[PDB]
């Protein structure tokens with residue numbers, strides 16, 4: 001007769017949630033907070049229940065972009081340039097303006113040579129160059145305005161601390177956006193960030209997402225200081241069950257670190273939900289030893305069942 | 314709006330009836346609906362050169378099409394006027410237009426519609442002075458060596474990732490270079506060069522006649538571009554559109570079974586194409602092979618367009634790209650399998 005009592009080995013926030021969740025014997029039927037879900041296979045209930053868990057527990061539910069909103073989000077960014085390394089494939093020489101063919105990590109691109117920043121002069125093809133590329137990238141992330149930080153991200157990339165801001169609506173987003181960017185710069189943070197650029201999809205708990213690299217503590221402290229002012233007025237107070245709350249509508253976690261070949265390109269929220277769905281299904285396919293099935297699935301996916309916002313070392 | 318109204322006024326069409334106008338799709342701003350004089354029009358605007366090579370090519374088609382019998386499987390809606398300086402064209406509206414993309418999703422682009430489409434394209438390719446002889450930028454060979462930075466800032470993470478996979482596939486890039494090189498070694502024909510299902514429209518909610526539209530890329534060019542595009546559209550419908558996690562082998566198995574069930578659609582098109590262009594293989598024996606190679610590229614093309622709304626490439630995308638690679642690097646076998654032989 002405590003949710004922690006019946007769900008030992010699991011973070012309390014998660015134990016509380018699993019009381020809104022049941023899977024029928026045989027795993028052809030499940031129920032997430034009145035959101036019933038059915039399938040004809042155990043295997044298809046895995047994908048549907050994952051979705052129901054993701055909506056109810058991570059996102060909290062149950063087309064185009066906007067040039068006005070984008071213009072205001074674009075203006076809020078405190079910088080305009082992110083230096084970027086890649087290997088010079090070839091200097092192209094034009095009278096209308098010389099150009100550099102550069103292998104960036106994500107693509108081979110044809111860059112104006114006026115963007116070179118190091119070396120001071122186009123080197124031989126094969127030499128690392130460094131280029132002043134726009135910080136803002138409004139098409140990169142569909143549904144979102146994306147910005148890279150002024151300071152280049154570490155080479156091994158490393159573990160990425162995610163921070164989610166539950167903007168209530170577009171106006172709050174602009175303010176939270178600006179405050180968070182101001183804060184992260186001043187703190188010399190290594191990050192990318194993005195904010196919803198579609199005014200008809202607020203509220204969302206991930207209306208703003210910050211990706212902090214290197215040492216996240218300075219930038220997290222800075223952001224928490226900068227936004228706690230607004231936290232509950234501009235941010236709705238609810239957050240994902242899988243995250244560590246830092247304040248009303250301000251939540252944090254790490255990018256999944258699943259050491260299983262098949263698991264990749266999965267968001268934090270989709271990954272946690274999938275692990276949870278699997279454990280819940282494996283449970284239903286026998287006959288609480290239910291919490292153990294859930295605990296096993298989280299651990300196999302690399303999630304710390306006591307702190308699921310974190311991964312195992 | 315001003316430049317459009319100016320043209321409607323001068324043609325005797327009055328103005329666009331804002332109460333009944335409606336925007337249609339494509340990379341251009343388009344308007345359709347009734348004018349204050351009651352006439353139904355389709356208006357297209359194209360951004361001029363800082364005129365407008367896409368409208369000059371579209372008009373070069375309308376000039377050829379006006380000298381055609383009303384029995385031609387190839388029909389224009391009817392050009393009402395144009396202002397190429399201002400980037401504006403006006404055509405007769407086709408009442409209750411359903412696009413070939415809608416028909417294919419609904420299950421209505423059947424074998425017999427595919428045959429009429431082949432007849433239209435075969436008719437096209439028979440018809441050449443005053444055709445742009447410049448090469449169509451598809452496949453985009455400069456982009457396969459390096460995307461312009463301005464293009465990267467307008468693409469999704471998945472489109473960029475798809476570009477990168479193509480750029481680093483040396484065999485694919487070399488095959489696409491060979492494919493474009495061959496265009497100056499074959500008998501050319503009047504060609505749309507931008508053919509997809511959404512460039513076809515059928516009147517009367519799908520019960521009317523068949524039009525092929527969007528002649529912005531109309532050129533004297535390799536006929537294989539249009540045949541390949543039609544095959545590639547079916548390829549892409551069968552191995553991607555209908556599927557939108559299994560194993561990769563299961564995605565491949567489903568995709569393969571789905572393609573086989575759709576091969577008659579490509580067969581009908583090629584039947585129809587030969588009905589109206591019976592001398593095709595006599596002049597170009599390589600046409601099946603080249604068509605299959607364009608069908609391969611067309612899948613990459615369609616997969617890169619579809620990714621604009623995604624942040625990662627899903628496993629179906631990747632499986633479909635794998636089929637595209639197989640058709641491109643093995644064009645003689647894909648031609649036979651696709652039914653483009655004899």
Ligand SMILES: Nc1ncnc2c1ncn2[C@@H]1O[C@H](COP(=O)(O)OP(=O)(O)O)[C@@H](O)[C@H]1O
Pocket residue numbers: 337338339340341342343355357390404405406407408410411412511512513514526527528529
């Ligand atoms: N005359 C017309 N009557 C009805 N619908 C049309 C007509 N012309 C074009 N459309 C529809 O509008 C769409 C856009 O036309 P299109 O010429 O392809 O423009 P874009 O160059 O922007 O692709 C077509 O795909 C077709 O579905």
Ligand SMILES: [Mg+2]
Pocket residue numbers: 339511512527
């Ligand atoms: Mg079009």
Ligand SMILES: [Mg+2]
Pocket residue numbers: 339340527528529
């Ligand atoms: Mg067009």
Ligand code: NA
Pocket residue numbers: 417420550555
């Ligand atoms: Na189909």
